[PDB]
Structures are given as structure tokens and as C-alpha cells.
Ligand binder design. Sequence first.
Ligand SMILES: O=C(O)c1cc(-c2ccccc2)no1
Ligand SMILES: O=C(O)c1cc(-c2ccccc2)no1
Lengths: 300, 237
Amino acid sequence: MNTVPFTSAPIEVTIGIDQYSFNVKENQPFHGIKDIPIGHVHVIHFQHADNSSMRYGYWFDCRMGNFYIQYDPKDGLYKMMEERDGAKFENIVHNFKERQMMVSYPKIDEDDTWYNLTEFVQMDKIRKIVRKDENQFSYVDSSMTTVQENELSDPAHSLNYTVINFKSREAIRPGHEMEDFLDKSYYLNTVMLQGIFKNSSNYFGELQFAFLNAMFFGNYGSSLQWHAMIELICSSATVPKHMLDKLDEILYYQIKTLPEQYSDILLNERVWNICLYSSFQKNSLHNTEKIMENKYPELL
Amino acid sequence: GAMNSSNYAELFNNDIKLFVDDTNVYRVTVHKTFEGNVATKAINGCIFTLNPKTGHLFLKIIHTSVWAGQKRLSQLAKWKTAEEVSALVRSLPKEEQPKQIIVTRKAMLDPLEVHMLDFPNIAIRPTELRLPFSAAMSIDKLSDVVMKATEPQMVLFNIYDDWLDRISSYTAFSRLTLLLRALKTNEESAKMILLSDPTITIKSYHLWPSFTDEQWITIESQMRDLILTEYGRKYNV
Ligand SMILES: O=C(O)c1cc(-c2ccccc2)no1
Ligand SMILES: O=C(O)c1cc(-c2ccccc2)no1
């Protein structure tokens, strides 16, 4: 188990760690998060008490370095930093662990929720969507736009998700206009899976990362990408059986974790009704359909 | 975006544009079978592609063989229309290609957009005008060429005959829409109005009779009366 220590907490803030969250008071003796499970990526995220504008946060993997957080009073935010002095890191962390100034990552033993949400998400792929090569961790916030959003404006601060556009020359072979528009299998299997992602695991990783950024930051372009990657599969007549079964599991745990009160803004009625009730794959997502109908029947 | 009565004069400016109406592409008769079921029989159709400024009509005749062994024909017809309009645009010299294509039915937007991806600067637009272009097959010479076709064929017409020698394209389009609306509402009565005087004839190279300016005023008034008469019969007014 690993630890993300904090130099201090000078401003009141709600702190998230993966799907958990807690409140820290202004100048409270908080010095970080311990017992973080090794083997998964994680996200530590923030919403200031005095200004809920800009949710922001950091994706990281404790296997890739020793990271600590410090408040920057000039830029007005909690910043993730990497400590290259290993002995110093352990010494400060031990002092804090001994005085019980850290919260414990509160994982129930029965609980696979975080694994189920991040099964295909790897740090190396995150760092290609979020480009800041000098850091081993990745900053994301609520207002960051996507490359596709910027084509329709600072490129250094953008989310480089794979562009999906159903009415584009990439999606439609000349001479196969009706076929390719009504059955997106070409676009899914040849263009996206064989060509760009190389395999379904990378595709699902980006889909899962998009969802998590929509949920944890309210990032709109991430929500658009999540829905586009679902619709591309559901609108394809020919999808490998293992992908359909895995997608049903992926979406089930996403819909299970979504805050009930954020559904009006995180779920696109058109896409979900099309995917569950009209698409080629309308009968292939049994678990997702059942949780959607029992949890959000109004949307449908 | 959409095209309506606020921006109506835009149809007659100097930016090349085409209306596309797909109503008559897939045409069927419905009949009983020997076993008492119901079956369709397709008949020849046409795409109505019109330049409202010049009167040039590109009538692509859709022969029933294009439907042979195909499924979901009402859906296919929209994509066949878009395929043929795209092929027409590609066949025209650059300086004759339209800057806008206006579809009379919104279901044509996505098929035409997809077939025209290679032409990102041609705008594909709907319209809020309810245009009576379905009644094109009530123009005898258009119906005759469509029904006699034994293979796919494109035929070119000027749907304004020689009117633009004497009137503006705004007035010519208004006359055409009034005539087509009348033919749509009561075909027999409209043709009787147009043909009742045997001394006024249709030139070999025209679609409509050779009315003088004053006679066109009379005909237009008779057509408006027909439409109002039919509205009164319909709604008991
Ligand atoms: O070099 C600095 O400024 C520094 C290192 C740390 C730090 C604090 C707590 C735990 C781990 C590292 N704070 O400031
Ligand atoms: O520089 C070090 O090695 C160091 C500083 C601290 C520390 C811890 C808590 C409060 C104040 C200072 N621990 O180690």
C-alpha cells in the first residue's frame, strides 16, 4: 500500500480519492491519504469550499513514483508534485503516519468497484490523452476541452481523445454510404479497433477514462466521448461476442456508481434509448438494461 | 439552416441552388393476391431536381429494376436519391455545381449529407415551404417519359418553358407552385382549365400551353378559384 502525503491544507476543500470523498476544513491538520491499493490507477480530486468552480484533479499510479500534494497560494490550487529524495519522503510520511494525520483509503474487502471501473485504464494511455510529458501524473479539470471540441482553444491544455464522427469520411467508405452509415461495423472494427486502438482493451480503457472524467469533474467533452464510444459499438451489426459481454459489465458498474442526482446531466436520453431499444445490440446488454430500467426509468 | 418565407427571395439570387424532391422515387400500386393477402407492385418513378432561378429540371427516371431483390425499399429510395443527386453534382462542371441543395423532406438530409461529404462547401438544407412538387407526375409530358422508360434515364427540361423571356424567376416560380398545387388538389379540374380552349396549344418543345400575358392572369385566377373551391368542399365552408 502507498501514500500521497500533503504538506498542508490551507483552504477548505472537498477531497476525492477514486469514488470516495471527504471534507477538509480551512487550516485543519490534514496530511494526506494512506493505504492506497497498489495495482490500479487512481485519481485524487478537489473542489474548493469557497468556490465550487473548477473541479480539478490528478491521475496517478503509486508504482511510478512518490507523489505529494502542496497548496500553491499564487495559482490558487492544490498541486501534485513528485519527490525524488526517497529517504526524505519516507521520513515525512512516517512522522505523519505516527501522529495519525492521514485518512485511510476506505476499501471494503468484498468491494471490486474501483477495479470494475478501471479494468482497462493504464497510466501510459492516460498520459497520451493528457499531454504533459515532464510529469508522471496527469491533471484534468472541469473546463478542459477535447480535440474534437476544439475543431468545432489552447491545444496544450486539451483532452486528446480519439475523434469519433459518424458523418465524416473516416467513418464512411466511398461507395458504401448507406451500408456504413446504417451499420457502423467498418468504422468500429477496421478503422478504430484494427487501425487506431489496435485492440478492444485500449478502446475500453479510453471509454472508461472518459466516463470517470465526466463523473468526477463534470467534464462535458468527456461525457460526449463516453457516449460516442458506446453508440459506435451498439450501432454496429458485427461485434466480437467477448466485446459485447465485456461492454455490458463495463456499463453496468458505471451506471451503478453514478450519483442518482447527477443523472439529468450525465446521461444522454437519445443515446441510451437508441442503444438499449433500437440498435443492433439492443438485446446484447442484459445487465445494463436491467439496472438502467430499475434505477433511471424516467430517462427511458 | 432551414429555408422559409422570411428568406424567400434567396431562391432567386445568383448563388446556384437546387431543390430535390424524392416523393415520386418509389411508387407502388397496392393489390390483393389470389390467397387474399396484399402485395405491392412498383412502377417507374423519378427524382425531381430543380433550379428555381433558371427552370432547369434534371429528371432522373427511376426504373423498377432498381428495386429488384432489394429490401426496405422506402429507406433505400432515400439513399438512391442521394446517390443520384451526388452523381449529378459530380457530372457538372465546377462552375455549374450548386452552392446549396434544398430537400423538400427532412428525411433526405442525412442520406444527402453522407453522399456529399466530398463537397463540404455545398450546404444541405431543409425548407419550411410545403412545395407541391409531388404533382410533377401530373404534367403529361413528364408522366409519359417516366412511364415509357425501359431503363434508367436522365431527361432535361425547362419547367418554365419560355416564361423568363417575359417575367422574373420569382414570378415564374410562383406560377409553377400555383399550377402544381392546383394539379395536386384537383387534377382533372386543373387540366380542364389548362386545356379547355383548343386554340391555345402546347408547343412541341414546351410543357405548358402558349398563353399570352393576359390569358395567364385568367388561368392563374381560375387556379386560385379551384383551390379555394376545394378548400371549401373539404372543410364545409
Ligand atoms: O521540497 C518541498 O518543498 C517539499 C516536499 C514536501 C513534502 C511534504 C510532505 C510529504 C512529502 C513531501 N513538501 O514540500
Ligand atoms: O525534512 C525532513 O526530512 C522532514 C521534515 C519533516 C517534518 C515533518 C512534520 C512537520 C515538520 C517537518 N519531517 O521530515
